[PDB]
Design a protein around this ligand. Structure first.
Ligand code: HEM
Ligand SMILES: CC1(C)O[C@]2(C)CC[C@H]1CC2
Length: 397
């Protein structure tokens, strides 16, 4: 038997712990013999699980195109995910427009805003002794940050989450497209207002930019708005949710982060390796042989980063969360020309979120009376993390 034959990132077998990690470990074991397998899912496609094979594919821009970045394709109507859904030269020219706001030096400037926000969110339920770590904290920290990045109202996370859900998981096609059309309508209004009353946000920045002499089309701007909205509300929320879940039951990892705050950055990278949400696809545009397999134009290859991040040939003791691991060349944020634009930002965000969470609530656990829930898909992570903790006090009010 072979686990590749029915491999499907939206339908990953879950173990008793509630995650797909037992399955990931088993597939990792099989990938030592067969690093790339054909899955019958989605009409048939390639599943690339070995670390060196993923590197070979992701570095080859000649035979692989990012037009297949989301598979099944995300619901974004007639729009494309800017940067992520493009190949060079188009990709490079668009990314250069937002490189500055995402530089490590620029992203460092969000630290205090994120520290205060995390604390403000925690105040909301600290006196209650219970709450869903995902919905209450993990979803909100990035939702608020992203809204600020886009010049949107921070208090409308449910609206943004509804759009994101439509793009990534709504099952009914029409309902999905109609809800994404809502995002487009809101974006149009935002763009027109920024057009005349600009601010210091990134949308404002791209609206005033120019490529080869001319301003970007409204459609291009909607693509920028969409991909940045997805990075925060989807990717970051699912990652942090899985992290909070882990910290709720792993009392060993938790006490060490509290005792060694200086290890938190390295710990964040190790958690990124272990709980990376993502996976990405690539559209084959040229017959190419990777490893022992030959791919043909028109086929799609899914890069299963979570399996590659557990490759024994790339990481010693891959199944353990070694907080002091360094270097840590995980693929959770991609590699090459499409490597995560938000890499430094999410490292800062995770450091702050974890630090403040453990500072305010050093003692907590999973709620024995409530169920945790894992969200499967191209971005996979905990969706519901009910926890309980001894009642505490608010910092403000
Ligand atoms: C923990 C959070 C996140 C994870 C795990 C994640 C992961 C990834 C990965 C795997 C890629 C590579 C795409 C490919 O190879 O095709 C990527 C690309 C990208 N990400 Fe992130 N991401 C996260 C958060 C964010 C955030 C917060 C933003 C920005 C606000 C963002 C913006 C982007 C953009 C624009 C690209 C495309 C870059 C390009 O094509 O050059 N991501 N991300
Ligand atoms: C899943 C992943 C990695 O995240 C986003 C934000 C960029 C590329 C793809 C699709 C959307």
């Amino acid at each position: 038997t072979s686990l590749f034959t029915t491999a499907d990132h939206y339908h990953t077998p879950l173990g008793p712990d509630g995650t797909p990690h037992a399955f990931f470990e088993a597939l990792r074991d099989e990938a030592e013999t067969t690093p790339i397998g054909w899955s019958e899912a989605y009409g048939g496609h390639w599943v690339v699980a070995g670390y060196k094979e993923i590197q070979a594919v992701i570095q080859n821009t000649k035979a692989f195109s990012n037009k297949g970045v989301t598979f099944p394709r995300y619901e974004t109507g007639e729009f494309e995910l800017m940067m992520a859904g493009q190949d060079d030269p188009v990709h490079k020219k668009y990314r250069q427009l937002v490189a500055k706001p995402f530089s490590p030096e620029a992203t460092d400037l969000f630290t205090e805003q994120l520290r205060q926000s995390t604390n403000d969110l925690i105040d909301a339920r600290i006196e209650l002794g219970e709450g869903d770590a995902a919905t209450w904290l993990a979803n909100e920290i990035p939702a608020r940050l992203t809204a600020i990045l886009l010049g949107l109202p921070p208090e409308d996370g449910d609206t943004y989450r509804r759009w994101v859900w439509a793009i990534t998981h709504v099952e009914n096609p029409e309902e999905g497209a109609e809800i994404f059309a809502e995002l487009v309508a809101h974006a149009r209004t935002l763009i027109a207002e920024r057009r005349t009353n600009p601010g210091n946000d990134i949308m404002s920045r791209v609206i005033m930019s120019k490529i080869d002499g001319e301003s970007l089309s409204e459609d291009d701007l909607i693509g920028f708005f969409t991909i940045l909205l997805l990075g925060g509300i989807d990717n970051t929320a699912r990652f942090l949710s899985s992290v909070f879940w882990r910290l709720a039951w792993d009392i060993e990892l938790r006490r060490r982060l509290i005792a060694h705050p200086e290890l938190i950055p390295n710990a964040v990278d190790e958690l990124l390796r272990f709980y990376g949400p993502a996976m990405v696809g690539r559209l084959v545009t040229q017959e190419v042989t990777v490893g022992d397999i030959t791919m043909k134009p028109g086929q799609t290859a899914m890069l299963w980063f979570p399996i590659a991040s557990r490759d024994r040939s790339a990481f010693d003791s891959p199944d353990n969360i070694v907080i002091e691991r360094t270097p840590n060349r995980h693929l959770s944020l991609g590699h090459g020309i499409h490597r995560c634009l938000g890499a430094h930002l999410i490292r800062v965000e995770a450091r702050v979120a974890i630090t403040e969470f453990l500072k305010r609530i050093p003692e907590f656990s999973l709620d024995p009376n409530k169920e945790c829930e894992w969200l499967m898909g191209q971005v996979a992570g905990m969706l519901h993390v009910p926890i309980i903790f001894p009642k505490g006090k608010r910092l403000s009010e």
